[PDB]
Amino acid sequence: IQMTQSPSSLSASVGDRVTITCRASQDVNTAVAWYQQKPGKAPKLLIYSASDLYSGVPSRFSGSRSGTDFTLTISSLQPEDFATYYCQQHYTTPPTFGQGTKVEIK
Amino acid sequence: IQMTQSPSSLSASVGDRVTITCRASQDVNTAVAWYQQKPGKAPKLLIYSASDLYSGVPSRFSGSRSGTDFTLTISSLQPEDFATYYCQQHYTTPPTFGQGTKVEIK
User: Which bin fits A15, alpha (ψ -120 to 50), beta or left (φ > 0)?
Assistant: First the structure.
């Protein structure tokens, strides 16, 4: 199962509302997580089960599913949120990542 | 840039030597890292720059490169090593993962 993640990279400003998308090549139910990775660090879990926030993750993050299309939205981009984001499906094993989205300041 | 990881899954007993391979679709020098992921947890960094161990990673893990071929070796598999392992190239941005290798008991 492939996850088609887009955009690959984007530039945006503090305060912007921005959405990253991940299309599963087939039904993965709700077995999708999103992660954030900074250079030099391992990825951190942000969202699990498509739409549930991990503890500590701020409310400006949200996830949603509609069929095979998954989105991560940040409602007001903050300086800490500039990073690379990955979707992962873990419906089959081993799980598969999207190719990622680098979120850079404009 | 694609990292083709092999095999998708393998089974082995405690005390076995296990090797996992990642072939880069072009020369990426040494810009490859390896991660371990357990179910329910975010990936943990094991190896960076193809062959350097992160602090805290036991000596039984090693990484090597030959051209576009990257190998993770676990010299003597321990009960704490059953997990899914990913290579990741960071020659381009955003970095891209291989498809993963599930290492399972048997």
Answer: left
Residue in B8, B42, B99 nearest the CB of A43: B42
Six token digits for residue B45: 């960094």
Residue (of A27, A87, A79) closest to A58 by Cα position: A79
Q: Which amino acid makes up residue B27?
A: D
- Domains, chain B, in order of start with CATH, read 1-106 (2.60.40.10)
Q: Report the candidate in A55, A92, A48 with the shortest Cα–Cα distance to residue A70.
A: A48
Nearest CB neighbour to B95, from listed A84, A93, A95: A84
Q: B84 and A96 in contact by Cβ < 8 A?
A: no
Q: Do A96 and B100 touch (CB under 8 A)?
A: yes
Compute the distance between CA of residue B40 and CA of residue A33 in angstroms, rounded to an integer.
Answer: 10
Sign of the Cα torsion B59, B60, B61, B66 reads positive
3-state secondary structure A38-61: CCCCCCEEEEECCCEECCCCCCCE
Distance from CA of B67 to the nearest CA of A (A): 23
- How far apart CA A8 and CA A100 sit, in angstroms, is 6
B96 with A96: Cβ contact below 8 A = no
Solved using: X-ray
Contact state of B45 with A41 under an 8 Å Cβ cutoff:
yes
